[PDB]
Amino acid sequence: SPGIWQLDCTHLEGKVILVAVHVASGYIEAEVIPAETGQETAYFLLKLAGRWPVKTVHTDNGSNFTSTTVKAACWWAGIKQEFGGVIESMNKELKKIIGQVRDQAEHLKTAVQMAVFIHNKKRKGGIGGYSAGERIVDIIATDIQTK
Amino acid sequence: SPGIWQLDCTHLEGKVILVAVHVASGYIEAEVIPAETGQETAYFLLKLAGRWPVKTVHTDNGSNFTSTTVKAACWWAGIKQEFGIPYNGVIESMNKELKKIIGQVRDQAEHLKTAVQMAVFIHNKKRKGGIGGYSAGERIVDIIATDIQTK
Amino acid sequence: QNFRVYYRDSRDPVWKGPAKLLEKGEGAVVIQDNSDIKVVPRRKAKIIRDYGKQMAG
Amino acid sequence: NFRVYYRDSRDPVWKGPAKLLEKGEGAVVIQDNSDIKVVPRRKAKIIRDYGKQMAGDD
Ligand SMILES: Cc1nc2c(c(C)c(C)n2Cc2cnn(C)c2)c(-c2ccc(Cl)cc2)c1[C@H](OC(C)(C)C)C(=O)O
Ligand SMILES: Cc1nc2c(c(C)c(C)n2Cc2cnn(C)c2)c(-c2ccc(Cl)cc2)c1[C@H](OC(C)(C)C)C(=O)O
Ligand SMILES: [Mg+2]
Ligand SMILES: [Mg+2]
Structure with missing residues (x-):
């Protein structure tokens, strides 16, 4: 559970964006790839x-x-692949933020990293609200303690 | 303190490697930049x-x-920049170990940028002292997690 | 204040900044860099807000 | 502990993951879908779980 990720590719302005979502937290990492x-x-994947x-x-x-190349990277890093909707819901929120900040950047890849920043650091509203970036850190921290 | 990072550029095989080290933990992030x-x-910086x-x-x-461009990124992301005093190294301590691991796994990769990411992988997961110790990746998570609990 | 402008003067390719924003017109931007009012075309002006800081804490 | 990826002669598509049987001086014996082949060391990328050994979790 602490190490489950969903990966998918999306497209904007003729460019390819590779998106990775940590399922248990909603934390995302995304980047334009050539x-x-x-x-x-x-x-x-090796970076992630x-x-x-x-x-x-x-x-x-x-x-x-x-x-x-991907199967080799997963063998080298010890990653299990699974080809069987969290990423679609979280990616819809990523596209939402990219449109919000698009005018603040010349290149799309810059706007993508601005949107990733906002997505991971935006706290939930109410009492005891945390961000996705805070949730994944907490999830990984508790799994380490239960060694 | 949990958000203190040191950044520097190093060179290998004629290419530019940008290294970021989390001071409190020794956790590093490196990548070949064009x-x-x-x-x-x-x-x-915006990615990090x-x-x-x-x-x-x-x-x-x-x-x-x-x-x-860097100052604009720090203003956008709310990062304080602390430039060193001219004429004078915690990053060098972890960067020395970074080059050591890059040489250990260089033959495992065609491109240097692949070997760099392999080295970052091994550096952040290597348990300090021995199997009974903790790694840099665990130390940074523990530092951030306990810092979250404060506020 | 939440805005910082970076701009190019003349054909000097190096970008100058940070300058303070005054008005972002259609094809021109009004700025002031150290008690010096400058009118820069929108193409030669890059306005940066502390937007990420305002969405973190 | 070891997987090998390779290209047959005059075939640009990389094959694998193949199971490594033995490694010679400049050749390797591998098995891809119950088919045993002898691929030169030049057209072979040998990948070990080097990162998995430095990460103890499953
Ligand atoms: C392409 C680009 N050029 C820029 C800037 C800035 C501020 C200046 C002056 N310039 C002109 C320049 C080019 N070289 N130098 C030396 C000066 C930015 C920028 C925009 C917003 C933030 Cl927060 C941070 C930087 C970008 C961004 O791209 C990245 C990849 C981020 C650099 C983008 O996509 O807008
Ligand atoms: C350049 C390269 N080509 C590779 C592989 C592999 C396994 C094959 C078969 N090929 C030929 C190929 C190219 N495209 N396709 C479709 C097949 C790897 C590799 C090496 C080690 C790991 Cl763990 C993972 C991948 C790399 C590495 O580069 C990255 C950037 C990592 C891809 C590198 O630098 O060695
Ligand atoms: Mg897809
Ligand atoms: Mg330097």
Whole structure:
């Protein structure tokens, strides 16, 4: 549960955005990639797995996610792949924020990182509200203590 | 204190590696950037600030770190910049171990940027002292988690 | 204050800033950099808000 | 502990993951879907779970 991620590709302004969502927290990481290829997807995964404890990734049957480069990265990093709606709901919120801040950036990739920033740090409103960035840190912290 | 980061640029095989180290934990984030410019540094910073609480960045007076693009990114993300005093290294301690791991796994990757991300992986998961110790990735999570509980 | 402007003067390619915003017109931006009023085309002006700071804490 | 990816002769599509059987001086013996092949060391990318060994969790 602490290491379950959903990955998918979305498209804006002719560019390819690779999105990773931590399922249990809603925390997201996203970046424009130069092409929707397995080579770029694998490099994305190696970065992600070196920063968060990635144990399982859920993707569709896209060619980039079934590539030999991605399967090798998952073998090297110890990631289990699963090709069987949190990402769609969270990505709809990412597209919402990208449109909010689009005029603040020249390049789309800059707006994407601005939107990722806002998404992960925006606290929930009421009593005891926390952000997605705070939720994933808490989830990983408690899993480490229960060694 | 939990949001203190040190950033510096290092070079390998003719390429520019931008390194960010979380001071309180030794957790590092590194990536090959196409040029040692403020434009690439600023994009690196916005990515980092969206992932971790980055409140203060310690850098030297390199042109990329003193650039207008970097200062604009810190103003947008609310990051305080702390440039070093000219004429004079905690990042060097972790950067020395970074180059050591890059050389250990360099043959495992065709591109240097892949070897760099492999080294970041191993550095952040390596338990300090031994199997009975903790890693940099666990230390930064513990530091941030307990800091969240304060407020 | 929440706005900081970066701009280019003349054909000097290096960007100057931060300057204070006064009005973002259609094809021109009015700024003041250290008691010096300047009128810069919208193309040569980049306005940066502390938007991420206002959405974090 | 070891997986190998390879290309057959004059075939640009990479094959794998193949199960490594033995490693020679400049060649490896691997098994891809119950088919055993001998691929040169030049056209072979050998990937071990090096990162998985430094990460103890499942
Ligand atoms: C393309 C770009 N050029 C910029 C700036 C700024 C402030 C200046 C003056 N310039 C001109 C320039 C180019 N080199 N130098 C030395 C000066 C920014 C920017 C916009 C918003 C934030 Cl918070 C931070 C930076 C960007 C952004 O791209 C990244 C990848 C982020 C750099 C973008 O997409 O708008
Ligand atoms: C350049 C490269 N090509 C690779 C692989 C693999 C396994 C194959 C078969 N190929 C040929 C290929 C290229 N596209 N496709 C569709 C097949 C890897 C690799 C090496 C180690 C790990 Cl753990 C993971 C991937 C890389 C690495 O680069 C990244 C950026 C990581 C992809 C690198 O730098 O070695
Ligand atoms: Mg898809
Ligand atoms: Mg330096």
